[PDB]
Design a protein around this ligand. Structure first.
Ligand SMILES: [Mg+2]
Ligand SMILES: [Zn+2]
Lengths: 353, 56, 106, 37
């Protein structure tokens, strides 16, 4: 983005990442790194130790902290005191967090200069309109019985993998795919991600996936028409640009965090055709009824309401029954899945040896 | 010459007064160089390369 | 009786030292026993007889590691033939290297 | 070539000393390599 938007010559630009660790030798240059590469203190590599000395030795004139909502953490705050810089700037789409340390930003980097409305840009064509929706999936009788006896830690997995959600996701994916819409399915649970991905034969991404493989997946989804839907995870929760994405779905969630809700929605807010007549992006939030999900759903969506977004309650999805095949339609499959998920919890002597 | 004054090891070799031993030192350093090194790292620092008369 | 030994190898290396030789140069089996013990710190067990014994004998045993090497049994005796040869040559009981013999003159 | 240049005539050649000789596997087989755009 730097290279494309400004006239910065490539020679003066250096990238400080895990892959390559060569630094610019020109009088003035740019180093783009991450907090983990500047906030880590105990274990730095020999290749990464020289770069850290290179960063520390020189007196920087400006620091750009992207996603400044992570700087007030326990250890990330150490960087602001160690590194030398005459001016500090913070960039973040969301300036809220669970703890009260958000107010500490005043004396850490400075006050908040400007903020921009969401609906104002939506009506001016700068960002796309969204038909936010909230789908209520009733809990199946069999699973709900274990929900009462089971503990909180295992209860989460119980009502997140109810068979009804599987049926709704399959119908929605097929219906939206024929509509020529690029769908994104979020799921914080890796086990559910793999099970959903393998059951539907679609690519999935999470922490263990290598950078090379995910890049190929992203490019294929972006430019290859065959891959119209993907399965993102917490890794893709923020700071990944998908200009072709228009529809968004989320299965699991990281409890009550309202920030993650806004970041995930941002993937479709930058859709390609955000100015064509009558364009309305879609955001579906499948949640199990009579579970702790309602506590987390209404608690993690209180920020978007403040911005101006309004969620539409979908108690019934029209035409869901007429779809030819639905997953876990028979009791036998439901029982099999129930047990499967329930069971989850002398240098010469050297030759001798 | 395969090695110019840009190399510290060559600098000391060229500082030898007597001809017979100076030639031996140069031969030892130069006989293991299998390329002309059209561009050589600058002596001020190894970041940028200073161009010298060569053919690669 | 005076006293690990479970994993000691059953192959024994026995060295018979000359009573006269250890008396030509002031030596005792205790010091040389430690000399062998320090060449290889604790990878083999050694017992040495006393001076009063009619015959001077050193018994050495190599101790195998916890992991079992099925392939080394074929060369187990050969390895003993190797270390013993190096124990006869590469061991410096006392003195300065490259010193063959010393004679006293007045 | 050097002799001609010294006498004034432009040589139509140069000394040959100047020339410088310079996780998921179920999708395998489906993803096309869109490396560039
Ligand atoms: Mg960003
Ligand atoms: Zn040359």
């Amino acid at each position: 983005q730097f290279l494309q938007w400004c006239t910065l010559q490539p020679e003066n630009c250096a990238v400080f990442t895990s892959d390559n660790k060569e630094m610019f030798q020109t009088e003035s240059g740019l180093v783009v790194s991450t907090y983990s590469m500047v906030a880590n203190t105990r274990n730095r590599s020999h290749d990464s130790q020289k770069v850290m000395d290179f960063l520390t030795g020189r007196e920087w004139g400006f620091i750009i902290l992207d996603e400044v909502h992570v700087v007030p953490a326990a250890m990330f705050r150490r960087v602001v005191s160690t590194i030398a810089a005459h001016a500090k700037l913070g960039l973040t789409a969301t300036l809220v967090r669970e703890d009260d340390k958000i107010g500490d930003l005043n004396f850490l980097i400075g006050p908040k200069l400007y903020e921009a409305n969401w609906m104002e840009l939506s009506q001016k064509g700068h960002i796309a309109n969204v038909q936010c929706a909230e789908v209520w999936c009733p809990m199946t009788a069999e699973f709900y019985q274990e929900y009462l006896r089971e503990t909180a830690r295992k209860r989460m997995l119980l009502y997140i993998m109810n068979p009804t959600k599987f049926q709704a996701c399959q119908f929605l994916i097929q219906y939206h795919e024929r509509r020529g819409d690029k769908i994104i399915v979020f799921s914080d649970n890796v086990y559910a991600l793999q099970e959903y991905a393998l059951k539907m034969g679609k690519p999935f991404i999470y922490g263990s996936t290598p950078q090379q493989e995910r890049m190929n997946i992203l490019q294929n989804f972006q430019y290859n028409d065959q891959i119209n839907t993907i399965f993102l995870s917490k890794v893709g929760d923020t700071s990944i640009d998908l200009p072709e994405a228009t529809c968004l779905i989320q299965i699991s969630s990281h409890y009550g965090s309202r920030r993650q809700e806004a970041q995930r929605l941002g993937r479709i807010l930058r859709a390609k055709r955000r100015n064509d007549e009558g364009f309305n992006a879609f955001f579906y939030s499948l949640v199990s009824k009579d579970t702790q999900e309602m506590y987390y759903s209404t608690k993690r969506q209180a920020f978007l309401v403040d911005q101006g977004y309004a969620f539409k309650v979908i108690t019934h999805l029209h035409g869901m029954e007429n779809i030819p095949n639905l997953a876990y339609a028979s009791p036998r499959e439901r029982r099999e899945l129930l047990q499967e998920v329930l069971l989850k919890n002398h240098p010469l002597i050297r030759k001798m040896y | 010459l395969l090695l110019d004054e840009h190399n510290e090891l060559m600098r000391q070799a060229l500082a030898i007064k007597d001809s017979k031993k100076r030639f031996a030192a140069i031969w030892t350093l130069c006989k293991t160089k299998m390329v002309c090194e059209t561009d050589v790292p600058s002596e001020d620092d190894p970041t940028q390369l200073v161009s010298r008369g060569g053919c690669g | 009786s005076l006293l690990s030994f479970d994993q000691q190898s059953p192959w024994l290396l026995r060295l018979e030292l000359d009573r006269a030789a250890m008396n030509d140069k002031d030596l005792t089996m205790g010091q040389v026993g430690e000399r062998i013990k320090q060449t290889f710190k604790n990878d083999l067990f050694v017992i040495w007889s006393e001076d009063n014994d009619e015959k001077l004998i050193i018994r050495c045993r190599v101790v195998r590691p916890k992991s079992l090497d099925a392939e080394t049994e074929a060369e187990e005796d050969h390895m003993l033939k190797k270390i013993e040869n190096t124990m006869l040559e590469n061991i410096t009981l006392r003195g300065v290297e490259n010193i063959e013999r010393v004679v006293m003159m007045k | 070539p050097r002799k001609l240049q010294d006498l004034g005539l432009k040589p139509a050649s140069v000394d040959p000393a100047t020339i410088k000789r310079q996780t998921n596997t179920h999708m395998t087989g489906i993803l096309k390599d869109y490396s560039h755009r």
